[PDB]
Amino acid sequence: EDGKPVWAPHPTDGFQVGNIVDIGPDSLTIEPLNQKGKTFLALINQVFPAEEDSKKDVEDNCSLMYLNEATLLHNIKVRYSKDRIYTYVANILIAVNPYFDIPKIYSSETIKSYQGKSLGTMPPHVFAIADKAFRDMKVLKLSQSIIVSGESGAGKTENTKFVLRYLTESYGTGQDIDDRIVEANPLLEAFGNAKTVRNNNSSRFGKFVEIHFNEKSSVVGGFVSHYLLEKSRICVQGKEERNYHIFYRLCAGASEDIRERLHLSSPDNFRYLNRGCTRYFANKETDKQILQNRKSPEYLKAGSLKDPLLDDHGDFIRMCTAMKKIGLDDEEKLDLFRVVAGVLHLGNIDFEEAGSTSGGCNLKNKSTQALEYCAELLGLDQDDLRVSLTTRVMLTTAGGAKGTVIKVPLKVEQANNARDALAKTVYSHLFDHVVNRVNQCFPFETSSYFIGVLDIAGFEYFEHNSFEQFCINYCNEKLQQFFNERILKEEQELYQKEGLGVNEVHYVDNQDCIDLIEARLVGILDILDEENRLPQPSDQHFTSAVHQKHKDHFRLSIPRKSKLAIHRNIRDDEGFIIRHFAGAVCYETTQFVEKNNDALHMSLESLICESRDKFIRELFESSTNNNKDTKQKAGKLSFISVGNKFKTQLNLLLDKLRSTGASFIRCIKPNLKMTSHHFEGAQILSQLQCSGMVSVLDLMQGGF
């Protein structure tokens, strides 16, 4: 526009009002409205059109005259001071966590005010999305999904329980499933929640709580499904990051009549915990309760971590209270502590060089008591387990004449990668036994249709990004593909319905970004599975092969060309910059190969399955119903895969989402401290640009 006030780039608030008093080809001489003497220069991507009266807000954001990404930011700045936390932006609901209890908006009188009424007949609320999902299920003959993204603590936990409260109170009229999520609230927190630099307590798996509806349309059951729990985090942690929270709550919160049974020591004595952060979270009363023998040198030197909602000393106590509430027995809870403590003494075993004759690798002299105190926890013989962690057993029998069983030793690096592959198998099959035990405390009556909630970790970005953030952000790019796929389909089901027109827009595709990461022996994940196979794996050869063959692609440049100055310190074969939906995020390639290269030997996979304990043999499947046992030996698949097993399980979730309808609820966190009324425009503007909301506004060209 010309003359009319436009938005101006303001440091703390994101955008401020301002006018244009001289102009260039792409640089604008911006005079601020409220700071007129500062008169700076600003670019085309820092100026946006603004509405005539600033004395208004919009309930229906499609009603804007100037609809852009700066006027969406101004609408949730005014509505936050009007006690309105819900905002209708087309088929996308923007919910802002206020960090206090607003008067009469979550009440039972509020629930029967919305009941059965459609969008555009009631103002913005999360109960108008939950009521839409029951009507766009039975009539439409389509199962539903509520998709929740955003940064941890942004309201993605809280809006989900208000949806499942609304589907039980408004339409189930009972059915005991609503507070069974609540009764095992710290129980599912400990196993999947970890600590990242950007998030103090974030769940690292795809929690998919589905709610079954039958042919009669009554709520007949629920089921809890889990997807994509981070494999690498189990064994390796970065600077100031942790493992899962049960590996700190069991270390801190275990009593002295339980610690003498489990043989626990402070985290500096456990190899899978001492490489990250060993500090526990606490509160003023529990910081006095953590014992002198439970403290690591990090805790002795720097004490407990700071955060008002986190206490790792007390939540192991409130976890075991929750096992009484959900449905776990007193004999079995003790066996659920021997397996967790067995993972901690699995990481301490170590393997040195060859002695002389017959090559191979042997254990270290200081790793003898580390295997004996672990083999009574995982139920294995102390003499037989040393052989399986050091040799590769195979046969001369395979297709011709009958032979015998031969022994080919493993290399030192093949034994270090094999010991960590066992810990990424045991804790992963333990977590399916905790979830499957919980799903049997409310077994469903029948099935036909379902309204589920997909909640996943958001787009994560730190100062230095690793392999853990490459696999999280690759999951958010595919979920961003499915976001834009349903929005283009919605406008196509709108223009001949209301008679608006035959107008059509050039779709926002991302296939070159997908083909860059995964393909048919062309992607980055395709090169990564090739590097695991090489005679001697390297870290210099993995980076250099990506810009050898994938050079032509636009969404890939060398780290030294980085727009952000900080990543220019990194050199050619140390990293790469990958452009995504939420921007260009650079990743280092240090330990990227090392986290991918775990592999599990056949008679080591067929040794932990052969366990000399009874709770342990139940863990590696399969159930009694239609019983059929796992074979003694195999050959194939050796390497198996890490980065392809993470891609394969994600493809099982993207095709389930394609059979369901969409209910996209984006959650915005207003401030860092998580306090009422506070506002940060250096964090709010960043979450509109990292949640895919910008890509939707840049697909909306309608003008209707």
Binding site: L534, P535, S538, H541, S544, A545, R560, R568, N569, R571, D572
Partner: protein
């Protein structure tokens, strides 16, 4: 902000920003291609490995020095040196700062032009300047008067400077030290039955030229007791386990630098080229040139200089005049420690050749 002193070594390229410590990167300039057919099939191999990476993989390459006889062989190899130097050591893009380059005294024209011109077009620096390597050791020693020595593999030079003006009419450039000392050591160690035909193995010759050799005080008289039964053997160990016991050749190799008639060439010894540059200066200045004889360059690191040089000069110099020779510690980094002081300080912040000035002026801006 800061300027970068990146020294175009004869050896031994040195790189580090201006102040406050010591050079950050040192490596011996070489490029090496893989000289045999591959069989491991990664493929995984670079078109050319530069140093230091080309010296951690000896015996499977064909080493090619880019700096030979005091001039660069071609900028096809040189640009790849430059790219390696900035990128996998210092970690900065050349467009960030004014740079500072060094050259050899009496450099062939237009090979300082063509260089200056190519470096501006290849790396796109915001400013450029070239200082001579001998002159920079003046700043390193902190002096105002005296004759300056940049002696590297293989062009040395002898420049006289007076308070603080340089003299165009007395500068002497010798094609001798140090690659002729390397090549000669290989020619007189072959003389005791150890052959080293291949380029990669020639590097081993340089490494014993560094470590085990020393300068005789009185050649004829050290040579006499070497001819006696007396043990001058120091036992070196080789990469394949070979044990070599060298004696005579150990003090013979650096001695080559005095009286080049060992080769048979006409060129005068450092003894006399030092002196003849002083006796090409005006008579009154000579008074303060004695006792400001300051040596530098890594090829002067041998033990026994400068007090051989001292005793020899004192014999040739006029009677009842004092000559003390100044030998710095850490002479290998002398030139760089020169450059570091200059480019960090005012006045010379406004004395660079800047981008517009260069664009307007063209290649004839160097002189």
């Amino acid at each position: 902000t800061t300027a970068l002193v990146c020294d175009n070594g004869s050896g031994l390229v040195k790189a580090g920003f201006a102040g406050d410590d010591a050079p950050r990167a040192v490596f011996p300039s070489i490029v090496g291609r893989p000289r045999h057919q591959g069989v491991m099939v990664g493929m995984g191999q670079k078109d050319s490995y530069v140093g230091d990476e080309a010296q951690s993989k000896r015996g499977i390459l064909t080493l090619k020095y880019p700096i030979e006889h005091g001039i660069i062989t071609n900028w096809d190899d040189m640009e790849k040196i430059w790219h390696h130097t900035f990128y996998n050591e210092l970690r900065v893009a050349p467009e960030e700062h004014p740079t500072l380059l060094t050259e050899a005294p009496l450099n062939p024209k237009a090979n300082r032009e063509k260089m200056t011109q190519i470096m501006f077009e290849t790396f796109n620096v915001p400013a450029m300047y070239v200082a001579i390597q001998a002159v920079l050791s003046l700043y390193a020693s902190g002096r105002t008067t005296g004759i300056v020595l940049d002696s590297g593999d293989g062009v040395t030079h002898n420049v006289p400077i007076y308070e603080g003006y340089a003299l165009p009419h007395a500068i002497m450039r010798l094609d001798l030290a140090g690659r002729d000392l390397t090549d000669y050591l290989m020619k007189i160690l072959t003389e005791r039955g150890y052959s080293f035909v291949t380029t990669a193995e020639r590097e081993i010759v340089r490494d014993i030229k560094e470590k085990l050799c020393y300068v005789a005080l009185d050649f004829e008289n050290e040579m006499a007791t070497a001819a006696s039964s007396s043990s001058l053997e120091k036992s070196y160990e080789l990469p394949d386990g070979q044990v070599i016991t060298i004696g005579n050749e150990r003090f013979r190799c650096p001695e080559t630098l005095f009286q080049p008639s060992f080769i048979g060439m006409e060129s005068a010894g450092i003894h006399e080229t030092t002196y003849n540059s002083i006796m090409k200066c005006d008579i009154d200045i000579r008074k303060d040139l004695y006792a400001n004889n300051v040596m530098s360059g890594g090829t002067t690191m041998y033990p026994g200089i400068a007090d051989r040089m001292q005793k020899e000069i004192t014999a040739l110099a006029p009677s009842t005049m004092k000559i003390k020779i100044i030998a710095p510690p850490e002479r290998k980094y002398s030139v760089w420690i020169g450059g570091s002081i200059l480019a960090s300080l005012s006045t010379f912040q406004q004395m660079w050749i800047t981008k517009q000035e260069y664009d307007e002026a063209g290649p004839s801006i160097v002189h």
